[PDB]
């Protein structure tokens, strides 16, 4: 008991001489005080956390880095109370507005081989562990009283400054006031609080013994570790495997991992120039459309068009707030021959945001929750894709209701369900790349139709013999994505006066014959031109002239886009008749 504090006052002094003395670098070059400088540079910025490394602590004093592996609970306290006595003799005198010394959350990382969740045997209870995984959930941050103060009820006696223990363990209020039995309540005005989250860590997929569903563990983040990771991340946790103390079997407890170290597994001025010169080089168009479909070959138009959807037009707000689209839609009609699934996978992989779908659905649903017994709202994919791109196959398989809703979503660009207890709106901002295998109106919700075709001549068969081994055997995306990420966000293209009179005279003469086309034959179905398709043409020309960072588009691409469209509309002309 009396030797307890006498040991501590000798550990809190050897943990302080570590931060105050540990250096790096050799004698030839020159040295660097590693942790004083980070304490100062993190305090003056207003961060209050250092990241101690366990190899250093081991190499300085070998005993401490062992205690820290065996009794991490009652020694992290001494470490974090020496970090506060060193951050005092380094930054003082604090200037004017701060003179109270804050508290330093000492995190800690390491370079040691990770265990796994399946290797957490109960002999590892309250020992630093180090496990990898994947975040699967994330609670909302909450408060957690640290330094609490109570008060009696009848005689109004106070007993303040009481300190909670960290982790998930409560506190046992007295019952002996020194007044009725339990006269003590909490004074909400005087209780310091800190944030805390609660994640959920699933084990990596390539370490399940493959007969079942992966197991998971529960974490407990703290002041500065909160809101640091997002469901879907890979991490590497260093925590204190411990047990809940809120006091199937008789003596069973719950268990969590109190996290005290976290990691994550994975623009420049000079990088800007490899975008600049590439946008400026004369044949900037085809260089991309060549390296966006290596496996599948043939008919680069179906790859020419896809180049634009990755960039897109620009979002305009007229004075009326009547905004305009900023995305495009594509249909690849034709037999399912698996030649298109490859392309879907590619465009999804090489996209800033993208989802390939065949669960809850695409658009929002209203489902009767078991718990609430009432209806709740399920925003599907097209609400999660913000500016991204959504790929779809088998356009006749999707649920009737779902297909209706996707029709309306591509129409208005938002989903608004007014049902049992749900009246909300979700902005759908994504790009539809559909593959077909159909009303003249859901078909007209798009603007570009590509159907598949072939021949059988023996020179054509030589082309086929070529294409045989191009698959038998089986500009980079890793920079293509980081190029688009800067191209989309720096160009403001509009049309020049000449493109206007080009398009007017193209579109008027496209209309002018549809009359004599439909007035005689009228084969119960056809497809004429509409102003929506014209606006599609304009937003295609924008995406073309954005490849070049060219703030003003001209006749350089309008005619070739119009011919691309002469392909894309004649396709549906042949299909619909």
């Amino acid at each position: 008991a009396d030797e307890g504090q006498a040991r501590k006052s000798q550990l809190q002094r050897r943990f302080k001489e570590f931060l105050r003395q540990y250096r790096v670098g050799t004698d030839r070059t020159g040295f660097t005080f590693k942790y004083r400088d980070e304490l100062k540079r993190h305090y003056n910025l207003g961060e209050y956390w250092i990241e101690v490394e366990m190899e250093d602590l081991a190499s300085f004093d070998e005993d401490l880095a062992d205690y820290l592996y065996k009794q991490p609970a009652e020694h992290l306290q001494l470490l974090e109370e020496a970090a506060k006595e060193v951050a005092d003799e380094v930054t003082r005198p604090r200037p004017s507005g701060e003179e109270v010394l804050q508290d330093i959350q000492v995190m800690l990382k390491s370079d040691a081989s990770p265990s796994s969740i399946r290797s957490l045997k109960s002999d590892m209870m309250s020992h630093l562990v180090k496990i990898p995984g994947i975040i699967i959930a994330a609670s909302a941050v909450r408060a957690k009283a640290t330094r609490i103060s109570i008060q009696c009820r009848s005689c109004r006696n106070t007993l303040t400054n009481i300190a909670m223990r960290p982790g998930l363990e409560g506190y046992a209020l007295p019952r002996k006031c020194n007044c009725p039995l339990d006269p003590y309540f909490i004074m909400p005005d005087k209780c310091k609080c800190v944030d805390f989250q609660t994640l959920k860590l699933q084990e990596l997929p390539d370490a399940v013994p493959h007969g079942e569903m992966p197991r998971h563990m529960q974490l407990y983040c703290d002041r500065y570790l909160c809101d640091k990771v997002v469901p879907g991340n890979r991490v590497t946790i260093m925590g204190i495997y411990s047990i809940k103390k809120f006091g199937v079997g008789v003596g069973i407890r719950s268990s969590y991992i109190r996290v005290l170290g976290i990691q994550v597994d994975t623009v420049s001025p000079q990088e800007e120039e490899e975008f600049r010169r590439l946008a400026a080089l004369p044949n900037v168009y085809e260089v991309i459309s060549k390296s966006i479909a290596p496996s599948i070959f043939g008919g680069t138009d179906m790859k020419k068009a896809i180049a634009c959807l990755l960039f897109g037009g620009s979002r305009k707000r007229l004075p009326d707030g009547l905004t305009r689209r900023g995305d495009i839609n594509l249909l690849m009609l034709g037999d399912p021959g698996t030649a298109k699934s490859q392309l879907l996978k590619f465009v999804e992989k090489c996209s800033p945001i993208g989802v390939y779908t065949s669960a809850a659905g695409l658009t929002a649903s209203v489902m009767r929750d078991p718990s609430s017994r009432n209806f709740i709202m399920e925003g599907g994919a097209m609400v999660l894709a913000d500016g991204g791109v959504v790929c779809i196959d088998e356009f006749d398989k999707m649920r009737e209701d779902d297909r209706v809703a996707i029709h309306e979503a591509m129409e208005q660009q938002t989903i608004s369900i007014a049902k049992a207890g749900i009246t909300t709106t979700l902005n759908s901002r994504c790009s539809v790349l559909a593959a077909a295998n159909f009303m003249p109106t859901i078909l007209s919700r798009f603007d570009m139709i590509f159907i598949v075709k072939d021949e059988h001549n023996e020179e054509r068969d030589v082309m086929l013999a070529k294409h045989v081994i191009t698959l038998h055997v089986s500009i980079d995306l890793a920079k293509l994505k980081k190029f688009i990420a800067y191209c989309r966000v720096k160009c403001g293209p509009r049309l020049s006066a000449e493109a206007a009179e080009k398009l007017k005279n193209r579109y008027i003469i496209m209309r002018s014959g549809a009359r004599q086309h439909e007035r005689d034959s009228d084969r119960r179905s056809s497809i004429p031109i509409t102003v929506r398709q014209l606006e599609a043409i304009v937003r295609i020309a924008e995406a073309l002239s954005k490849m070049k960072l060219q703030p003003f588009a001209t006749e350089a691409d309008v005619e070739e886009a119009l011919r691309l469209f002469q392909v894309s509309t004649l396709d549906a002309a042949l299909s619909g008749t």
């Binding site: 909302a140 941050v141 909450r142 408060a143 957690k144 009283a145 640290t146 909670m164 363990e169 409560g170 506190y171 046992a172 209020l173 019952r175 339990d182 309540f185 909490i186 004074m187 909400p188 005005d189 209780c191 609080c193 800190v194 944030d195 997002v230 469901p231 809120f246 006091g247 009547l322 609430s372 017994r373 009432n374 999660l384 913000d386 209706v404 809703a405 309306e408 608004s416 369900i417 007014a418 049902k419 049992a420 207890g421 009246t423 909300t424 709106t425 979700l426 902005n427 009303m439 003249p440 109106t441 009228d522 119960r524 179905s525 056809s526 004429p528 509409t530 102003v531 929506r532 398709q533």
Partner: protein, 471 residues
């Protein structure tokens, strides 16, 4: 865009003794320009509890207090509301006793406090904040005692009792024992007429959709309205609450978990969106009475030409849509009959003729317009559907679309992709003007006097100009 003030700053033109004696000096306000002595009187002539203050003024008057008030909101707002009753007794002591206690809202521009429910961390505990966002539920208004008045039929005395809970600015948990025998000799009997209760609600603000990082389920926060701030927010709004932030502890069985629940004790509310236009200038009414007199021949045509300039052609349709936006006159005879006074328009035609455009414009022009489609709308979800509650479990009648839009406009696009069993649910609400529902445990008649603007694609995909208008 960052809302760093409740008044949109772009186009606004078109011991505890020091605090109490500084607030009073601030509320004098006479000698500089008399800004608040023009407001205390103003509310006394309207019988209000609370007055809204601009902290922007507190800054210019006294910076030290303006900073000490945004960081210790409780001890400062218990001294503000005292030196406000003090200053109202210094005008009319007769009024200063009609009300138990006064209140004081806030408004202005707080520096870093303008936070969202996503940024509201635990460094804002006991600090005035200004949360923005959508209301996504409400609670049932319930009284809550703040004082009792008892009586002794034997001794003919009268004892009182003052109550307080954890939802005050002083926070002492009193017991609601309602004493019946203070001294064992005499019996008591409560007097409800002379006691004092107040209202109490609990709403849930939730982060704006277009401000979420879209990866998660946007965060929320719990507000505790009170004392005639109560019904100031319905589900689906965009509010800017300005209230203290607070943590309220608990204990179930003498052993407390450290985890607390944090709420926002609101003391002002603001609807961000302006959804009304009754604010006209005398110069404006002058212009109006000019224009209405200039030419009586051509004012209708001149009105309709300027209706939707973004559309070419369709002069007739614009004329009729204007007629819609005005409306007729609802005559109700003496015996109790009723004749509708609305116009319902239907537009059919080939694709891409700006139909959806006309609809989306009529939406924004008229106030209280509701949009709806032809597949995202069932026959019952348009008018009224029966459901239950989660707290009480007893049925009620949730209002459909065409009952929210009362005295308004309902815009139905693709009115033809609506099944036959769904149109029929309208024939009562489009002419008779009110919906009648007789379901299992529900028998109601809701008022739905509205007007329908509908757009439908013709059969055969395109209008065959040879068949007939009926086919």
């Amino acid at each position: 865009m960052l809302p760093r003030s409740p008044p949109l700053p772009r186009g606004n033109l078109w011991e505890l003794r020091e605090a109490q004696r500084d607030y009073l000096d601030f509320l004098d306000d006479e000698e500089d320009q008399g800004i608040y002595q023009s407001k205390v009187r103003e509310l006394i002539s309207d019988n209000q509890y609370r007055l809204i203050v601009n902290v922007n003024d507190l800054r210019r008057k006294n910076e030290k207090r303006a900073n000490r008030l945004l960081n210790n909101a409780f001890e400062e707002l218990v001294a503000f509301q005292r030196a406000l009753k003090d200053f109202v007794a210094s005008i009319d002591a007769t009024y200063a006793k009609q009300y138990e206690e006064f209140y004081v809202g806030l408004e202005g521009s707080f520096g870093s406090k303008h936070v969202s429910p996503r940024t509201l961390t635990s460094c804002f505990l006991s600090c005035v904040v200004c949360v923005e966002g959508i209301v996504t539920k409400c609670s049932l208004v319930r009284p809550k005692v703040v004082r009792s008045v008892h009586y002794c039929p034997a001794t003919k005395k009268t004892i009182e009792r003052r109550y307080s809970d954890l939802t005050t600015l002083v926070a002492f948990p009193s017991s609601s024992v309602y004493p019946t025998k203070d001294e064992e000799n005499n019996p008591l009997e409560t007097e409800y007429g002379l006691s004092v209760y107040k209202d109490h609600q609990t709403i849930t603000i939730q982060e704006m959709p277009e401000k979420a990082p879209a990866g998660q389920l946007p965060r929320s926060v719990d507000v505790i309205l009170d004392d005639d701030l109560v019904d100031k927010a319905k589900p689906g709004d965009r509010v800017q609450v300005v209230g203290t932030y607070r943590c309220l502890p608990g204990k179930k069985g003498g052993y407390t978990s450290g985890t607390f629940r944090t709420v926002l004790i609101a003391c002002n509310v603001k609807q961000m969106s302006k959804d009304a236009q009754p604010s006209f200038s005398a110069e404006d009414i002058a212009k109006i009475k000019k224009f209405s007199k200039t030419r009586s021949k051509d004012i209708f045509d001149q009105l309709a030409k300027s209706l939707a300039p973004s559309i070419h052609g369709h002069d007739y349709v614009k004329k009729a849509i204007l007629c819609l936006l005005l409306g007729g006159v609802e005559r109700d005879l003496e015996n109790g009959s009723h004749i509708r006074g609305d116009i319902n328009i239907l537009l059919i035609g080939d694709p891409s003729v700006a139909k959806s455009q006309l609809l989306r414009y009529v939406l924004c022009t008229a106030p209280r317009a509701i949009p709806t489609t032809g597949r995202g709308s069932s026959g019952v979800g348009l008018t009224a559907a029966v459901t239950t509650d989660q707290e009480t479990g007893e049925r009620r009648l949730e209002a459909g679309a065409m009952v929210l839009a009362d005295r308004g406009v309902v815009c139905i696009d693709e009115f033809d992709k609506m099944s036959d069993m769904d149109r029929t649910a309208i024939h009562e609400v489009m002419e008779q003007g009110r919906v009648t529902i007789a379901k299992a445990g529900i028998h109601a008649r809701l008022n739905a006097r509205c007007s329908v603007l509908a757009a439908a694609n013709p059969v055969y995909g395109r209008y065959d100009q040879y068949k007939t208008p009926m086919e």
